[PDB]
Amino acid sequence: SWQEKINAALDARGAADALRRRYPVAQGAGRWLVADDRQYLNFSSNDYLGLSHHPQIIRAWQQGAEQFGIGSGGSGHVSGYSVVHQALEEELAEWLGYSRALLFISGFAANQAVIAAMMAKEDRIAADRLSHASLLEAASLSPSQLRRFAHNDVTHLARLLASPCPGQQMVVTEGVFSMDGDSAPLAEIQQVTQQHNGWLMVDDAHGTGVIGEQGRGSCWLQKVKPELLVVTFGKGFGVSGAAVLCSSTVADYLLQFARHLIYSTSMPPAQAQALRASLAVIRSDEGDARREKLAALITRFRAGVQDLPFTLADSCSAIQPLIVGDNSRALQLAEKLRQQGCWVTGIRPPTVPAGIARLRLTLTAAHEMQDIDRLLEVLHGNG
Ligand SMILES: Cc1ncc(COP(=O)(O)O)c(CN[C@@H](C)C(=O)CCCCCC(=O)O)c1O
Ligand SMILES: [Mg+2]
């Protein structure tokens, strides 16, 4: 019965210490975390360039409310398509070298709407095995067939694309992977994708704004233009939302068939003004300064881990993992760090694969070398 169904499931999660509870925070983004009116250095957020508290971004969010009120009033297919929404999309499309952009309320929504609109039961989705849960979930629910290729294995991907297919195939991967921080062999991936008349879909949540010239992300940097690029704004951009970069025809296609775009309220125009300002910083000289400082900090942290008995879970991005060599995967070293002012976190399956529960540390440009020195200090010891 319903409650038995509920209760059992909850019981199974308990049994693996797979149980998640939220902790309420006063501040969760950027240099500092504030919890229980207790300040910690924050190594758990996704605010990679420290824009969540940029004065200009804050101001565009406030002024926009002054100008546009809050709610958009409806769907972009009725009276909810603001000129500010339009401008943001044009600016995004201009920035990344695409003909069109389409705003979504979230990255999760964008990925699922694309995969749902475009894939049919005859089709195939070849996705990296560590692709984000919104992609895999959706490809899973899709009536299309889903095949995963081993992480970054272009050989394997080739084998899956080569397999006789009744319909079309979509390759999907990430620019900067969620949990490991590594990148995908994009030029190599796109060439086998192309060889099989595939289309490539790249999710650059974790690279967008943070690498490449003008922070244009993983695809620009690597000289690849996937037919679909998803960019999401709740990380480096410091806000919320997402967009789908694509051609004019695919764009038109997505406007007809992507329910999340048709049957969902558009974002408040003021949120969109905030995103445009964020884009401005990211493409600005301040944008470069922030990217370079983040790189400086990564270097610093990474060199520091050399004198340490841990996993330098080879990452050049703001994401620096640490697999679990023991931890009521839930916590420690995690707590030790926490008690010492370094707010860190334990990431466990199903989010992570296997005996792979971990410390997913993230650096940001809001941090300072003395913050990193401390996290180094505390991983090393001191008290
Ligand atoms: C690669 C990637 N793509 C898309 C999205 C979704 O975009 P959105 O945030 O705008 O909807 C994210 C989210 N990454 C973050 C938000 C997570 O997936 C958090 C996972 C936390 C796991 C917690 C646990 O395992 O206990 C992302 O990591
Ligand atoms: Mg994620």
Side-chain angles (χ1 to χ4, degrees):
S1 90
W2 274 116
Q3 196 67 42
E4 311 206 88
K5 172 174 169 131
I6 288 317
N7 281 341
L10 273 171
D11 281 343
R13 280 292 272 256
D17 200 344
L19 215 69
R20 274 95 166 145
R21 296 105 169 199
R22 297 114 109 215
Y23 46 88
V25 306
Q27 300 294 343
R31 196 187 175 194
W32 301 103
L33 184 137
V34 180
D36 240 278
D37 301 273
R38 230 118 59 227
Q39 301 256 344
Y40 311 69
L41 280 164
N42 193 351
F43 297 112
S44 89
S45 91
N46 293 331
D47 186 35
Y48 302 131
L49 298 169
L51 298 180
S52 185
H53 297 283
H54 187 290
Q56 269 158 68
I57 299 175
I58 294 186
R59 161 162 147 139
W61 170 282
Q62 300 168 316
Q63 246 125 262
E66 216 75 275
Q67 176 154 182
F68 292 104
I70 304 319
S72 83
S75 164
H77 289 53
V78 187
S79 92
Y81 185 58
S82 194
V83 292
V84 170
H85 290 137
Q86 191 177 234
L88 177 48
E89 302 182 331
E90 302 177 345
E91 296 167 359
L92 292 164
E94 188 272 326
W95 172 51
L96 295 154
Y98 282 79
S99 157
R100 300 292 287 293
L102 292 157
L103 305 176
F104 281 84
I105 201 60
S106 84
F108 197 105
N111 285 335
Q112 302 223 334
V114 163
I115 282 182
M118 256 169 100
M119 317 295 307
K121 61 177 229 221
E122 298 87 17
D123 292 330
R124 179 189 294 129
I125 301 172
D128 194 281
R129 183 184 172 278
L130 307 169
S131 289
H132 180 256
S134 61
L135 300 154
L136 282 199
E137 157 153 278
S140 200
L141 289 189
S142 180
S144 54
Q145 161 200 247
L146 172 81
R147 289 293 181 267
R148 297 164 265 170
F149 55 102
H151 188 49
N152 278 347
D153 191 333
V154 173
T155 303
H156 199 8
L157 166 66
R159 266 197 274 87
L160 298 169
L161 306 171
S163 249
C165 184
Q168 302 306 137
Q169 321 184 64
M170 182 74 82
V171 172
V172 344
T173 188
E174 299 191 13
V176 178
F177 283 91
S178 231
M179 294 310 171
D180 262 293
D182 56 343
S183 296
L186 281 198
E188 300 219 277
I189 280 166
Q190 153 160 76
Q191 154 188 322
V192 293
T193 293
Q194 272 162 21
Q195 159 193 136
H196 293 281
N197 317 304
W199 270 7
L200 180 55
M201 180 194 186
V202 171
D203 173 346
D204 198 27
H206 296 286
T208 195
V210 174
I211 46 163
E213 134 146 301
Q214 275 186 69
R216 281 167 176 114
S218 307
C219 288
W220 187 274
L221 184 56
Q222 291 181 46
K223 309 253 170 273
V224 179
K225 190 188 185 190
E227 286 86 348
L228 292 144
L229 165 70
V230 183
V231 306
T232 211
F233 306 132
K235 296 121 181 81
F237 268 64
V239 188
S240 187
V244 182
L245 284 284
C246 61
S247 65
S248 279
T249 52
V250 169
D252 286 349
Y253 183 86
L254 290 171
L255 284 181
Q256 304 307 301
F257 300 115
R259 297 208 168 100
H260 240 308
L261 240 206
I262 309 161
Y263 296 102
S264 194
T265 297
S266 55
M267 66 186 56
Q271 171 178 158
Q273 281 293 65
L275 289 167
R276 296 175 75 196
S278 186
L279 224 210
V281 172
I282 288 165
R283 313 176 70 163
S284 97
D285 289 328
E286 186 180 346
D288 299 340
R290 286 182 178 269
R291 287 175 230 109
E292 221 319 317
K293 198 225 226 166
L294 177 47
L297 295 172
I298 289 167
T299 299
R300 190 178 189 92
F301 170 73
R302 262 176 91 76
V305 129
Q306 307 188 351
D307 329 312
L308 269 163
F310 301 136
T311 47
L312 190 31
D314 196 282
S315 170
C316 279
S317 73
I319 296 166
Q320 310 274 334
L322 299 186
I323 200 217
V324 156
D326 299 357
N327 179 223
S328 174
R329 69 134 131 172
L331 196 41
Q332 188 199 29
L333 218 58
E335 231 63 320
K336 329 307 315 145
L337 280 20
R338 257 177 195 173
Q339 269 131 88
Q340 285 245 90
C342 300
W343 190 274
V344 306
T345 256
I347 170 57
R348 342 167 242 173
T351 299
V352 113
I356 286 208
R358 23 166 58 117
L359 229 31
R360 180 213 188 230
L361 302 178
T362 61
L363 313 169
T364 118
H367 272 104
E368 300 294 346
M369 338 193 288
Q370 68 254 201
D371 305 343
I372 302 274
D373 284 1
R374 177 75 200 167
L375 163 61
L376 286 172
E377 208 174 74
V378 153
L379 294 148
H380 277 125
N382 145 273

